[PDB]
C-alpha cells in the first residue's frame with residue numbers, strides 16, 4: 001500500500017526513497033513465500049501448550065527474553081564481537097569481556113540471583129570507554145537512546 | 153437499556169467510518185486479543201507515556217472487529233465506551249449512584265459476553281464514592297465484564313498501584329513509543345485525512361521532514377503526536393495564505409497602516425524636541441512604503457507566469473515554535489552572515505583571531521554541517537585584563553537577538569564553596585527549595601537558543617567544573633525534578649584571567665595545572681587574547697566619544713571634538729597592564745567633570761554644542 005502510492009510523487013528527492021521500498025518489499029515477499037511453503041512440508045509430513053509457550057508469554061510480558069535461542073539469534077551472539085567492532089576499535093580485551101557475559105546468560109549458565117554482569121571501565125581520556133557502552137546498548141535494543149543513564 | 157444512558161457505542165462509531173486509520177502495532181493488538189479471550193481475569197490495561205498511541209490501539213481493534221480479522225472468540229462482539237463522568241451527574245441522594253452502577257453491571261452480565269466495556273482514563277475509577285468503584289471487584293475477578301483500559305504510565309502508580317487488591321485484576325500491556333521509520337509510515341497513512349479537511353496537498357518529502365526534524369528539536373514530548381502537529385499547522389497556515397495575501401506582504405502592510413496614524417497624530421505636536429522624532433519616523437514610513445510596493449510587484453511576476461506544503465513550511469513551523477531558527481538561509485540572512493566579523497568589529501576592536509572563531513561556528517551550523525548532538529560551540533577565551541573578553545560575549549549576544557539582556561549570564565565568582573552547586577541544579581526531593589527547580593536549568597528549558605556565559609570561571613571551586621563536564625560534549629543535565637534539559641543549540645562561553653602576562657606557555661601551562669585533561673578535552677579552541685597596541689586605542693577613543701554623545705542626545709546636546717584632543721586622549725591611554733579601562737576614567741575626568749560643572753551652573757543649555765580643545769596640558773570646553 002505504501003509503494004503503490006509513493007511512486008506517483010512528482011519529485012526527485014523521494015526517487016531514492018522509492019529505490020529501497022521496492023527492495024525491502026521484494027526481500028520480504030521472498031521470506032513470506034518460503035515460510036508459507038514450509039507450512040506445507042509441516043502440514044504433510046502444534047497441538048499442545050508445551051514448556052516454551054509459557055516462556056514466550058513471560059517474554060511478551062516483562063520484556064525479558066527467556067526463550068530457546070531460535071537459531072537466528074545464536075548467529076548474532078557469535079558475531080557480537082565483529083558487530084561491535086563496527087563502532088568501537090581496539091580494546092578487544094574489553095569487548096570480549098562485555099560480550100561473553102551475554103551469551104553466558106543466554107545459555108542459562110550465570111547465577112540467577114545477581115546482576116547479569118556489572119563491571120567498571122577505566123583508562124585515559126577519549127579512548128572509547130563511553131562509546132562502548134552506547135554501542136552495546138544499541139546492539140541489544142536497536143536504539144541508542146533507550147538506556148537508563150545517570151551522570152554521577 | 154440502561155447502557156444507552158451512560159455510554160456511547162464505539163463499534164457503531166467505527167462502522168460509519170468515523171475513526172482514523174490505525175497502522176502498525178500488530179503485536180500490541182494481538183496481545184490485547186489473546187488477553188481479552190481467556191477464561192478468567194480477561195481484561196487488559198494499556199500503559200505507556202502520553203501520546204504514543206493507546207486509544208489508537210482500541211480504535212484499531214474496533215475497526216478490526218468490524219472488518220472481521222479477529223478470531224472466532226471475538227467475531228461479532230460490540231464494544232461499549234463507558235463514561236464514568238455522566239453517571240455521578242445527579243446522585244445527591246444516598247444511594248442513587250450505587251443503584252445506577254448496579255443496573256449497569258446487571259445489564260452487562262445479562263448478556264452472554266457480547267459486550268466489551270472500555271473505560272478510558274480508568275484511574276478515575278478509584279473515586280465516585282463521596283465504597284464505589286469497588287462493587288466491580290467481584291465481577292472483575294471472574295471475567296464477566298471484559299475491561300479494556302488505558303491510563304498513562306505515572307498516574308497508574310499514583311492511583312492504582314496504591315490498591316494492590318484492585319490492580320491484581322489487571323494484566324498490563326506496555327506501549328513503547330515508535331521510531332522515526334515507523335512514524336514516517338504512520339504519517340504516510342494519515343496524510344489523506346488532512347488533505348481533505350484542509351483543501352491542500354502534502355508532499356512525502358515533507359512527511360519525512362516533519363518526523364526527522366521533530367526528533368531533534370522538540371524533546372519535551374513523545375512521538376507521533378509531536379510529529380502530526382507540524383503537518384497540521386503547516387497545512388492550516390498554507391490555507392490561510394491561500395485565502396488572503398501571503399505572509400511578509402501582510403505584516404509590511406499592517407505596520408504601514410499604523411505608522412500613518414502615528415505620524416498623523418504626531419505632526420500636531422506644538423513642540424520643538426518632538427520635531428527630530430517626527431522627521432525620523434517620517435523616513436521609515438517612506439522606506440516601508442517602498443518595499444511594500446516592491447513586494448506587490450514581485451508577487452505579480454509570479455502570479456502571471458506555493459500550493460502544497462513542503463520541507464520548508466515544516467521548518468518554519470518548528471522555528472516559530474521553540475524559537476530555534478532552522479530554515480534555509482533565505483538570502484537575507486546569508487548576506488548578513490557573510491559580513492559578521494564586520495558587524496562584530498563595530499564593538500570589539502582587535503582580537504581578529506578570536507572574532508573569526510566565534511563567528512566561524514555560527515556559519516558552519518546555519519549551513520547544516522555541525523554535529524546535531526553537541527553544543528553549537530564551546531570555547532573559552534582568556535588573557536590579561538581589560539582586553540575585551542567579556543565585551544565580545546556581549547557583542548555576540550546582540551548580533552543574534554538584538555538585545556544584550558536576552559542571554560544567560562552567571563557570575564562564577566560566587567561559587568566559592570562546593571555546596572553552591574545546588575544553586576544551578578535544584579534541590580533533591582524532600583528538601584526546602586524543591587518546588588522551584590534549578591536556576592540555570594529552568595532558564596534554558598524555556599528558550600533553548602540563548603548564549604550562556606560563565607564569567608570569571610577559575611575563581612570557583614573545582615567541583616562546578618565537574619558539573620559542567622557533561623554540559624560540554626553532550627548538552628544535557630538533569631535537575632532535581634528529573635527533567636533532562638538539552639543544550640545542543642546554545643553557545644557556551646567561559647572567560648578567565650589565568651596566566652596574566654605570560655607569553656604563551658606561562659599561560660598554556662597555567663591552564664593545564666588548574667584544569668583536568670578530561671575538561672580541557674571537551675572544549676573547542678582555547679582562544680588567547682592579546683594586549684592593546686597604541687594604534688588600536690585611537691579607535692576605542694572614537695567609540696567612547698560616540699557612546700557619550702548618544703548618551704547626551706537626551707538633551708539635544710552635542711559636542712565637537714578636535715583631532716588634537718582625540719589623539720591626546722589616546723596618548724594618555726597608558727600602562728599596558730590595565731588594558732582599556734583607564735581610558736574610560738580619563739574621559740570622565742577630563743570632559744565629563746567640567747561639562748557637568750558647566751551644565752548646572754547655567755551658561756550651557758540644551759540645543760547647544762560645546763567644542764573641546766586641547767589646552768597646553770588639559771582640555772577646555
Ligand SMILES: Nc1ncnc2c1ncn2[C@@H]1O[C@H](COP(=O)(O)OP(=O)(O)OP(O)(O)=S)[C@@H](O)[C@H]1O
Pocket residue numbers: 087088089090124125126127128129130131132670673
Ligand atoms: N575506539 C574508538 N572508536 C571509535 N570512536 C572512538 C574511539 N575512541 C574514541 N572515539 C571517539 O571519541 C568520542 C567518544 O569518546 P569517549 O570514549 O566517550 O570519551 P571517554 O571514553 O568517556 O573518556 P572520558 O574520560 O570519559 S572524556 C567520540 O567522538 C568517538 O567517535
Ligand SMILES: Nc1ncnc2c1ncn2[C@@H]1O[C@H](COP(=O)(O)OP(=O)(O)OP(O)(O)=S)[C@@H](O)[C@H]1O
Pocket residue numbers: 172173174175176177201202203204205206207208303304338342376377380
Ligand atoms: N498507530 C497509529 N496509527 C495511526 N495514528 C496513530 C497511531 N498512534 C497514534 N496515532 C495518532 O496519534 C495521536 C495519538 O493520540 P492518542 O493515542 O489518542 O492519545 P493517547 O496516545 O491515548 O495519549 P493519552 O494517554 O490518551 S493523553 C492521535 O492523533 C492518533 O490518531
Ligand SMILES: Nc1ncnc2c1ncn2[C@@H]1O[C@H](COP(=O)(O)OP(=O)(O)OP(O)(O)=S)[C@@H](O)[C@H]1O
Pocket residue numbers: 499500501502536537538539540541542543647648649692731732733736
Ligand atoms: N578591544 C576592545 N574594544 C572595545 N572596548 C573594549 C575593548 N577592550 C576593552 N574594552 C572596554 O572595556 C570594558 C569591558 O572590558 P572587559 O573585557 O569586559 O574586561 P575583561 O576583558 O573581562 O577583563 P576582566 O578580567 O574581566 S576585568 C568596556 O567598557 C569596553 O568598552
